[PDB]
Design a protein around this nucleic acid. Sequence first.
DNA 1: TATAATGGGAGCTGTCACGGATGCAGG
DNA 2: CCTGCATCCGTGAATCGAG
Lengths: 30, 57, 52, 110, 338, 170, 1111, 94
Amino acid sequence: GRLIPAGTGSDFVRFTQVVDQKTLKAIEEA
Amino acid sequence: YRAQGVKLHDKHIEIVVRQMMKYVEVTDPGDSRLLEGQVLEKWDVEALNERLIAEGK
Amino acid sequence: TSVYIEDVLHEFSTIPGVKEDVVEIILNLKELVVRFLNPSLQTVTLLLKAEG
Amino acid sequence: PVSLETPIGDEKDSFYGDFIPDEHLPSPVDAATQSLLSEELEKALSKLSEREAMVLKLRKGLIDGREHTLEEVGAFFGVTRERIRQIENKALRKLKYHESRTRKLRDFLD
Amino acid sequence: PQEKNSLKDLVYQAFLRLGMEKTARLLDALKYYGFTFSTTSGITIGIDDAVIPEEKKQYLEEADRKLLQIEQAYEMGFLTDRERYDQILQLWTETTEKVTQAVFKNFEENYPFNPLYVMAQSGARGNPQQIRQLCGLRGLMQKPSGETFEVPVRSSFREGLTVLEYFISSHGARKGGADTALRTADSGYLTRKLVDVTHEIVVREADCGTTNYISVPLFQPDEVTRSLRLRKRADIEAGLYGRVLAREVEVLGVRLEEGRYLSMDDVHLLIKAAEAGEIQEVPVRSPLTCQTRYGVCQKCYGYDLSMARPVSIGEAVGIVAAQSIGEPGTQLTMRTFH
Amino acid sequence: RVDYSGRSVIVVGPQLKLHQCGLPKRMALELFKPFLLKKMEEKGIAPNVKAARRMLERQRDIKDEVWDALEEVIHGKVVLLNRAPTLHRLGIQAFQPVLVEGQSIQLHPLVCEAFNADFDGDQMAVHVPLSSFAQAEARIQMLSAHNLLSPASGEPLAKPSRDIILGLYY
Amino acid sequence: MEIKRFGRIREVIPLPPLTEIQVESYRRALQADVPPEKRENVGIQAAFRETFPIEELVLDFLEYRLGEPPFPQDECREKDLTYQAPLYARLQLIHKDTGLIKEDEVFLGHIPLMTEDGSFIINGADRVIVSQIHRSPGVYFTPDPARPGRYIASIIPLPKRGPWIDLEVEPNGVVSMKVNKRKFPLVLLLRVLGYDQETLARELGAYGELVQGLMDESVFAMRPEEALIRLFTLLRPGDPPKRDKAVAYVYGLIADPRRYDLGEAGRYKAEEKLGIRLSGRTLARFEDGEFKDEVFLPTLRYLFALTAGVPGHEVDDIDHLGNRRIRTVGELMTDQFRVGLARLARGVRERMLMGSEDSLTPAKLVNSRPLEAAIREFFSRSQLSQFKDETNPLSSLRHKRRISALGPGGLTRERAGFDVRDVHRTHYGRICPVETPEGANIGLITSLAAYARVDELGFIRTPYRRVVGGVVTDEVVYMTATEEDRYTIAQANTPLEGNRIAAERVVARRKGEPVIVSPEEVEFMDVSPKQVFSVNTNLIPFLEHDDANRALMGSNMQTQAVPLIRAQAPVVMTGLEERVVRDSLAALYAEEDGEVAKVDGNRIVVRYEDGRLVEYPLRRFYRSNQGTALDQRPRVVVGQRVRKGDLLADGPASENGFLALGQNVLVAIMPFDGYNFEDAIVISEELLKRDFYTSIHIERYEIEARDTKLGPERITRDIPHLSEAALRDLDEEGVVRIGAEVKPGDILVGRTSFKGESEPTPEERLLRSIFGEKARDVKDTSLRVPPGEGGIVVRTVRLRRGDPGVELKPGVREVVRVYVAQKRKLQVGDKLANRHGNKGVVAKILPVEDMPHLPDGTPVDVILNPLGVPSRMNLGQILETHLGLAGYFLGQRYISPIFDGAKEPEIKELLAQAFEVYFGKRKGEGFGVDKREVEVLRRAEKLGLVTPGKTPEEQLKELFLQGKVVLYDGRTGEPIEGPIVVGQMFIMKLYHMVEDKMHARSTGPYSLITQQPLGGKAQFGGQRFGEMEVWALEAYGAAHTLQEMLTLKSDDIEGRNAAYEAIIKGEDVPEPSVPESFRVLVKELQALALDVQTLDEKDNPVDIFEGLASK
Amino acid sequence: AEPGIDKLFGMVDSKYRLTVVVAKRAQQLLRHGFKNTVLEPEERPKMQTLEGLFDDPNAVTWAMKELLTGRLVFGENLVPEDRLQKEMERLYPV
DNA sequence: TATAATGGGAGCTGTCACGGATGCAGG
DNA sequence: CCTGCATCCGTGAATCGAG
Ligand SMILES: N=C(N)NCC(=O)N(O)[C@@H](CCC(N)=O)C(=O)NC[C@H]1O[C@@H](c2c[nH]c(=O)[nH]c2=O)[C@H](O)[C@@H]1O
Ligand SMILES: [Mg+2]
Ligand SMILES: [Mg+2]
Ligand SMILES: [Mg+2]
Ligand SMILES: [Zn+2]
């Protein structure tokens, strides 16, 4: 019943991250 | 499938046929622990061979 | 738009002495054509009583 | 008793026990309702002070899971048992007025 | 005139050029105007629309006189029972063909807008075999054991069948119904086999870096003429379209680089260059040679045939492969009765 | 066997866009029942979840406010239509539901070739992807309009057929 | 209206009683109306005679008798009882030593009786016992699939009675015999029979190189007794070779009439096959102290003669209907009666040697329970005992003519194969080559042909007209398949002038093979084309113009037709429509000539020639097995003078005696905006206005108030924590009032049950304390309305305990049932279909103004897609539309016999006559040709449909003859650019409706072990996501959608509770936990003593049970 | 079809990565109450109601729209997860 | 807790085609 | 004594509905 290792379950694309430029700069400078 | 009017890529059949050739048989163990007649995956026996022939065995 | 028969609870009933079932009688009342002489009249409740 | 593996139909693809629901394990509705009741009750007990709500939480067994007599609650808070019964009367009465106004806990009466 | 094939090539070309979204809007548009024009077209079906050709009676008489000539050649002991059986089958087969072509030639010439002919030509519904049964003779029916009956069904569905012809028809019809009901259990079984052996095959990496490949032949060694001739178009398309070259191929003044995803036009070009005689086989990256562990790579696979673009890493290939192989097998078994 | 899954008889939906399907309000009410409960509490149709669910459990206690609320619920969200037997991957496809009067599921004509489904009485199952992740997977990968070619042959899988071919040929 | 018919064929004999295979069989097995002294030996009587007497005290059988039913039929249907009759048995206990004779009549329980129509009633439900088809007993010789020149001999007795025997010549030369999975030389068995080398040498010596393998000197070296002992050591290893013990086993295995039993049919089959005669039905006999042969020598004779290639010896087709027979209801019930009676006999033998050897009576010695259990078993949990199809009269009528190869003694689904599923040449006139289920039972389940009946041996016989010379005699001869193979039988449509054959070369049949032959060589002739097909297949007009596949659909779907309230007979009939409502007991007729006294909806009273007053109570609004309302409607008025066999009251789905499975609607065959895309159908709103395709459906809702250890369940109007608005339509006893309207959520019957003992959670304790209301002692468990259902309550049946006449099953106090009906109009999703196989669902209900209409302003009812016609190859509906159009304007109906029906030129004639009424009316009203009609005509003569130059009236007639008319699009006013075929078609509304099917589920009941959602609409279950649907998601690559189905949406408990909680809180769903079904797998694997451990990358054990499984 | 689906497929190396990006961004938006959006007031996806046009309740629509803007950053190992979470709750309280 | 009693009873026969292990006679 | 062929036993045999 775990996440299948394909598509959105492939390690290749699974660990991708999303961040808006406002938070992006907020963490970058800090 | 061609005779029945079905256009199907050979690619898919190649996938399955590839899975048919996935196994090999030992004709001589050498310095390994394997036995004559023992059947195993080709990837594993090539991994053992690269671990043996590079070990000098 | 509506029908009430004495001693009849629902459309699927059957009236003693009467050949037609309630569903059929209602179906016949659909064919009824009632003209209103007065344009101000939007509803009429008719009465029917017969036997023998 | 009758077997749960009793054949249903002339095929072998169906069993008797397949049509029997589980009456024990809580449906998601039950667990959600129980959680909503605990949350709404805590929302109701926060309309009181911490002391007069603690008297009730110890009285009916919300905390620790034990219902206490007036002597034990009085032995804890440090007041007389009649003071505890007085506090619990005031707290319940406040919760009655809170209920009469808010109309929140009413749906949980089941 | 627009029909199934021309519209299909339109959808494919629209998908390549204009993308998914606009192609989808094109589909909705074709759907709308298609329906709106079909309803006011005036296409109906009456018993007179199944046009029995004047040739049919003549071919029946000719077949009957030929039948009695075979009997004439039998009772004198000239030929075997097997020989008369084969000649009777061959007779009614040729007769059937002559009748069918007479139906559609009569349709094209005299009644070119006849509903049956319209729905057949456009690919909107039927094929000449069914239409023949409506107009010309039904043809030969087979014994459930196999083979074929000596006596054919001479009637059509318009003329009306004799109870004998209907009974002989019920023999084959029962076998067809049994095919869609029982025989399908074999194909579906194969499908599950293919899935279980390919279920772990996924596109994992971009390139396994293999230096190996396969040679896709553009010519098949005939046994008849004993000379290598060009293979059929669709077959070559099924073996080249959406693949990746492992070697550079330069023909007809065109460079095809190594790592090039062959488009449909690239394949058509390769076929024309093969007819020129510049190339006889095409080197291509194949899963057969791919050295990616526990699956395949993007370059060895090629196009994701649904998107007509390089396969996305992570796409479960093995499942798709197993599905797309077993699907026509089971589906065609359901259509045996047609 | 999974929750949030319904089933009904399919009906041709020529008016639908390729990415859409018709869905009964009754089915949509039950399939999105927890979502409908929350949205009802967000509005003034019910004080809380318990009273709202008690309201839905009686047909004559249903008023138009819960329908328009349900309209706000399923907006942007998609469902999955499945037709047995599932022979290939297009046996399941994602569609944006369109609430309709009646107890039938409306299916877009062009995908009838992909599902291999005619309207001689065929039925279909409706599964509802819950998580935002599952919703994203359906709307992108499994959406009907996003799949126009056959993964088998590469040829157009969703193409004009029957009435459409006839009309254009005419 | 006038009824015009066609055809030149005059069928002599009418169709036999259609339910005869049920009634005449069961009665023949009972002989309850036959005086015991004049009773023959069959069925129940044969069972008593075969099981009696009991050897060891001797208990003997005299005679039995059957009393009258304790309750009438409708009373059994009402009180959920079984329609049956008491069985008494006269027995005399005789002491073989003393001579003491004690006689008494013992009671053996009840035996279920068959109703008039041929069905049964088992515990309040109508049930049909379907006849069984199997291999006839006897001796068959089938070619050995291994050795080409060698053959397999098979000796087959009745099912369950005796083993099968295989005689085979081995490669080593000796003939072998196989019994009960044991092979041995046949020579030994022959020796036991008393045979010698002499007898076998003179008898079998005709064939050399064969009998020498039968010759073994070591076999003749021992006496018959020694050979018998030798054989017993072969069949029974380990068991002591005692003489009397060996005699007992071998005799019981072969010669015993009680254990081993050939069929009386199998007896005759063996006699005719081997050219001999058999005294009994056993392969051998025990006479004068030893074993005497009967069957084995002639069989071995035929076998060796077959292998040698001796003329006069053939193999046997096992699919041949001369080698396949039918076990009707009577024989099936008898066989099970034999088994139960045998068990009772074992009880007798057991109780004789026990208890008093002196004082015993037939009453004391008899235990009826084994017999009761056996009969009750056969009528309940048997496969051939099926739920009666009471959809329409035709449904049950066909159901009683069903033939199954399945059931006990039949074929398993995996044991089937398509060799038996095919059609044989012997099926001609016997078994319908068309009617069959298109499911997994195709070929196994079939229907009996019309003119066909089953003889006493169990084979199916068909009538044939006697033909001598050129004269065709009116006498008819029913023949078996083996007998039919002897003669040359011509066609029914062969030209006949008077009784004399006219044709020079007729079409005939010799052993199934068609042959053009002379009238001097014609021995017999087909009675009618109708005998080839089943009853349902006979109800399809223009059958010869339809594909066999869609004909199958038509025959099957007519069974699925719901009786409409305005149902009408088809405009184009085949002639059997009346006869169906005759043989089926739907309608009602007058017994003798007489006058009508009273007419009512409830009853019809008639005074006859006898003067006696007979009152017929009418069945009204009674719920059938499928929910279709079955009511009878009076068709006569007060004072009406009737005759013998005249219609009194029309039953369900019947119009003036004729069968009404649907309605005659005005159809138009044209594409319509893709709403008829792929078999879809567009209808007019007018069909709903005048209530076409409207039918009443009733549903039965039951509830039980039982005794619990926690306290009684009480049905009352008092339900805790409920509003008065919800208790509206209930009476004071808790039952809903009759005539009220109920919707989903409403309470049909209120019931209270005491709460299970449990500590109320502290939250609940505080909640009770706050609201100042003590918790109610009881709990609400009420029978409510299932989602998607409802209607009007017409009846309420309340049974209790303590009140007279009613006693329920132990623990139950009172049983209350509610009957809720509903009138169902035609809505989008319901399934419409015709008799020619055309099917589809209603995809659109257009307002009348959008509907395509005639020039005179008449809108069509149904819009059918022409694309459905050519690929499906059923042109019958086209002709039905044509003749329906001509009959529409002429105002007359038609009868078109199958294969003998109306032909095109006659239809053209009737169309022309209809055209005169059509256009002649117009031109008489002072209206010329429409300008749009001009354009249509222009495009029509460009279409080559009409001859150019002719006047518009001549052209419009040329189109009308083709069945096409000018149609106007209601939306535009502009005409359709071409002429369209329009006419009346008989279309039925099938049982499959969206009201019965549509289902949706958020959350609901979960299974016990798996803890996964249940299945089906009835159980409010979820939809199955099979491994194929898993593949579909996998192939897509949608991991989180698949993980959803595998956890949160099904099997994960914590995850789904937190999920539901999250959604109603507006929060996103939680991360899915490990499924419960895998934990079940783990522990089930541990029960198999296999350790299954979940690990991390450190190979250290991970506990998915979270400490609950570890100490 | 989803608006500008071809552009979105062109933005990533594999279409499944696009799905992950959309899903995760929609999760951020749904959790923080749509106040962390990069969409200008005129770019806000609306929904037709009986009252008037309100914001689109579907976070997935917002995610794909934001992705079309090109104002988002997608990739791997760009930031400690705990840091991103607590910082987004700092700027946009939940 | 006491005459003496001492080796069972019903088989389900109309699938089929595969892999692999057992056993047989033959070179 | 060791290979080869005959033969034995055990295992499979589409999906979803309802029932
Ligand atoms: N009661 C049944 N099964 N009727 C079958 C039926 O009406 N069909 O239309 C069948 C076969 C035609 C026939 N009558 O032989 C049919 O083709 N249905 C359309 C689809 O439904 C599916 C299907 C039908 N019947 C099956 O037994 N299995 C199937 O998978 C197939 O995917 C098929 O493509
Ligand atoms: Mg279908
Ligand atoms: Mg049964
Ligand atoms: Mg083998
Ligand atoms: Zn590779």
